[PDB]
Design an enzyme around this catalytic site. Sequence first.
Site, PDB file in Angstrom:
ATOM      1  CG  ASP A   1      10.994   3.121  12.571  1.00 35.56           C
ATOM      2  OD1 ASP A   1      10.558   3.945  13.413  1.00 35.56           O
ATOM      3  OD2 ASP A   1      11.840   2.038  12.488  1.00 35.56           O
TER       4      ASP A   1
ATOM      5  CE  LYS B   1       2.446  11.382   6.844  1.00 31.45           C
ATOM      6  NZ  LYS B   1       3.237   9.895   6.941  1.00 31.45           N
TER       7      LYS B   1
HETATM    8  N1  LIG Z   1      -4.607   5.912  -1.298  1.00 33.91           N
HETATM    9  C1  LIG Z   1      -3.369   6.008  -0.605  1.00 33.91           C
HETATM   10  N2  LIG Z   1      -3.305   5.801   0.611  1.00 33.91           N
HETATM   11  C2  LIG Z   1      -1.970   5.901   1.194  1.00 33.91           C
HETATM   12  C3  LIG Z   1      -0.889   6.125   0.580  1.00 33.91           C
HETATM   13  N3  LIG Z   1       0.048   6.039   1.498  1.00 33.91           N
HETATM   14  C4  LIG Z   1      -0.450   5.769   2.787  1.00 33.91           C
HETATM   15  N4  LIG Z   1      -1.798   5.775   2.482  1.00 33.91           N
HETATM   16  C5  LIG Z   1      -2.688   5.424   3.739  1.00 33.91           C
HETATM   17  O1  LIG Z   1      -2.108   5.718   4.869  1.00 33.91           O
HETATM   18  C6  LIG Z   1      -1.882   4.493   5.824  1.00 33.91           C
HETATM   19  C7  LIG Z   1      -0.508   4.492   6.212  1.00 33.91           C
HETATM   20  O2  LIG Z   1      -0.142   5.236   7.278  1.00 33.91           O
HETATM   21  P1  LIG Z   1       1.171   6.413   6.959  1.00 33.91           P
HETATM   22  O3  LIG Z   1       2.335   5.422   6.955  1.00 33.91           O
HETATM   23  O4  LIG Z   1       0.867   7.077   5.722  1.00 33.91           O
HETATM   24  O5  LIG Z   1       1.227   7.387   8.229  1.00 33.91           O
HETATM   25  C8  LIG Z   1      -2.268   3.361   4.799  1.00 33.91           C
HETATM   26  O6  LIG Z   1      -3.559   2.706   5.712  1.00 33.91           O
HETATM   27  C9  LIG Z   1      -2.925   3.875   3.546  1.00 33.91           C
HETATM   28  O7  LIG Z   1      -4.344   3.667   3.820  1.00 33.91           O
HETATM   29  C10 LIG Z   1      -1.223   6.423  -0.866  1.00 33.91           C
HETATM   30  O8  LIG Z   1      -0.291   6.614  -1.558  1.00 33.91           O
HETATM   31  N5  LIG Z   1      -2.584   6.449  -1.355  1.00 33.91           N
END
Ligand SMILES: Nc1nc2c(ncn2[C@@H]2O[C@H](COP(=O)(O)O)[C@@H](O)[C@H]2O)c(=O)[nH]1
Lengths: 303, 319
Positions: free
Chosen positions: A234, A109
């Site tokens: 959050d 990320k």
């Molecule tokens: N495949 C996968 N997707 C993730 C993971 N963590 C977050 N996401 C993706 O990121 C989105 C959440 O946004 P974030 O909180 O990461 O900005 C979710 O729709 C999810 O699909 C992970 O560990 N594995």
Amino acid sequence: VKLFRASEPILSVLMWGVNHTINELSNVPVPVMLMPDDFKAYSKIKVDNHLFNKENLPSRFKFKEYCPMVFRNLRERFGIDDQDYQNSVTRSAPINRFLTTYDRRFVIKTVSSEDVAEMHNILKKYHQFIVECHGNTLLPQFLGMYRLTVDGVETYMVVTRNVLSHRLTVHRKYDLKGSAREASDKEKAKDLPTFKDNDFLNEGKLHVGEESKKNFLEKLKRDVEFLAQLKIMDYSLLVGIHDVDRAEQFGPGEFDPSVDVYAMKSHESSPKKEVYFMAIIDILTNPEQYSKRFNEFMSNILT
Amino acid sequence: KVKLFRASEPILSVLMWGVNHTINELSNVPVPVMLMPDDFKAYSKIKVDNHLFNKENLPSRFKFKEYCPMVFRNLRERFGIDDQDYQNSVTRSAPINRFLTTYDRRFVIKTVSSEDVAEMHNILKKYHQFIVECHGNTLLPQFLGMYRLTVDGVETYMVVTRNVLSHRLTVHRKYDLKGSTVAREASDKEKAKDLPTFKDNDFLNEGQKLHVGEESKKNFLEKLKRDVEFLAQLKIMDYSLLVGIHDVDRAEQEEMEVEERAEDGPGEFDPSVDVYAMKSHESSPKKEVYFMAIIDILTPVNPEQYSKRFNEFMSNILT
Ligand SMILES: Nc1nc2c(ncn2[C@@H]2O[C@H](COP(=O)(O)O)[C@@H](O)[C@H]2O)c(=O)[nH]1
Ligand SMILES: Nc1nc2c(ncn2[C@@H]2O[C@H](COP(=O)(O)O)[C@@H](O)[C@H]2O)c(=O)[nH]1
Ligand SMILES: Nc1nc2c(ncn2[C@@H]2O[C@H](COP(=O)(O)O)[C@@H](O)[C@H]2O)c(=O)[nH]1
Ligand SMILES: Nc1nc2c(ncn2[C@@H]2O[C@H](COP(=O)(O)O)[C@@H](O)[C@H]2O)c(=O)[nH]1
């Protein structure tokens, strides 16, 4: 032979960087304990290649790894082998910012300068917590933190263990905070929809036998308590649903618990046949309030 | 198989780190059909700033530059030197002695001037092609790498060659020869040294000869002929013929005394490894091994002249 061929320089630099740092570390003794300086430490490499090896990598780039000793230790505490980690990143370009390694094991990320700052700020207490829970936690598992410089532009990255399976397709994912939150008309469009509290609560839902109910709830408690004590908030509980039957249309429902660490079989005497994936996330930012609120909303999806 | 790069001096740890680092990277770079002109202007450069990390042997802050690395890899192949071996010889343990040897005595690492580095560049295109067309058969130095290290904001240039001497057989007397009418002898100081580098007057003063036998002598003189004409072709002058002599019986005895001490095949070598080595004529007095090669050709009473004087002398060194 690693070409670091990738659809983007940044990615190639990433691949080159993980490769270089893991190799370098393989020459650094595993210490008897981490030390305070390890939490203020970094490795910095600057590459300047004139007329050489340009086929995939920029001639000029920078790669900085934060606190390499601490993250190497975390890797081991999370049961991850350095050579595997390295191979996951370098064998093949990671894929779609929020990236995955080509084998879907690690999430990569992009984060901000202040994210990296918040991370430095909690790293010692987080390490200490990981030690104390013997790695058994729903928290994100931080594997490495990097800063790339490509074309004069700095980009920070954090590598976690994937919450979702790396082989079992997900059919519906939720994002829960336990507190006005539905999915958007535009968001409801694509195949992989990310629902929120309302959509699931109003939809009606997760059956993981008591044995799993107890552990899970028990793990979630200590975790969010820790988060509270960090005055952090959050965060959401990413939940994945993999309905086995829909997959049938090398077996189904089959997974390696040492790899899909967050995965959970549906209960025998339950409705449909599924595998759930559940973990906390996005904790790099009322907090105690938030915790109990969060903790409460998650205890209610577990028959 | 941890590599600490431990060394008596920080320069050496960086050398080991650098050779190790570049060789690995090269292993990720395909091997080209041919070399392209820019490969001769190319270089790699890495700069390290470690902070509170990995400080036991390496400095926290250093630079490492490899010149024309595609070319030197190719020169390595054409000299039958595998990259992993090269890497192993430099990194398994610190070089030892500015003039270094790899711990196993296969490669010489020389500290050179910026001028020298400049001259490697001038001659590099023609040197490579010369090596190509003689298939690696030459008394010339075999160049395997050129580097610039930076430690403490001080820059050090190094050229790696194959060792002219054997990596195993002891040398019991060496000469540096030119054939210059100017008196060349070894200093009263040099003489007192353990293994003095003697010179022409010395060689001649000693009635020294080298009995190698016809077939050997011809192949040697044929190499020397193209080699020094090549050198004359370029402005290049003042090079020498390094001549090392190995005394077989003396070695056997020395070896024997060595076990006795410690306890409290013979006159033979691998031509693929001790590349400049010749056995003495079946009809020589002492059973000997000779090592003979050109050295010091990095410096531009002339060159054409010099070649001829150099050539005549050497060829008169043997029988
Ligand atoms: N495949 C996968 N997707 C993730 C993971 N963590 C977050 N996401 C993706 O990121 C989105 C959440 O946004 P974030 O909180 O990461 O900005 C979710 O729709 C999810 O699909 C992970 O560990 N594995
Ligand atoms: N507390 C702390 N913050 C850091 C450290 N290194 C970087 N950061 C923070 O992370 C962000 C990135 O810094 P940079 O690595 O780009 O210099 C900056 O906000 C910086 O202050 C560190 O060693 N300790
Ligand atoms: N001909 C040539 N000479 C070079 C090149 N790079 C460096 N040199 C020479 O080698 C010396 C050292 O250069 P540095 O790498 O320290 O800048 C310089 O005096 C320069 O003349 C090159 O690409 N071509
Ligand atoms: N063992 C070994 N010694 C060398 C070689 N080349 C030069 N030397 C020796 O190392 C010293 C430095 O070499 P120079 O500066 O004369 O080229 C000289 O005294 C010479 O005798 C080599 O290839 N192998």
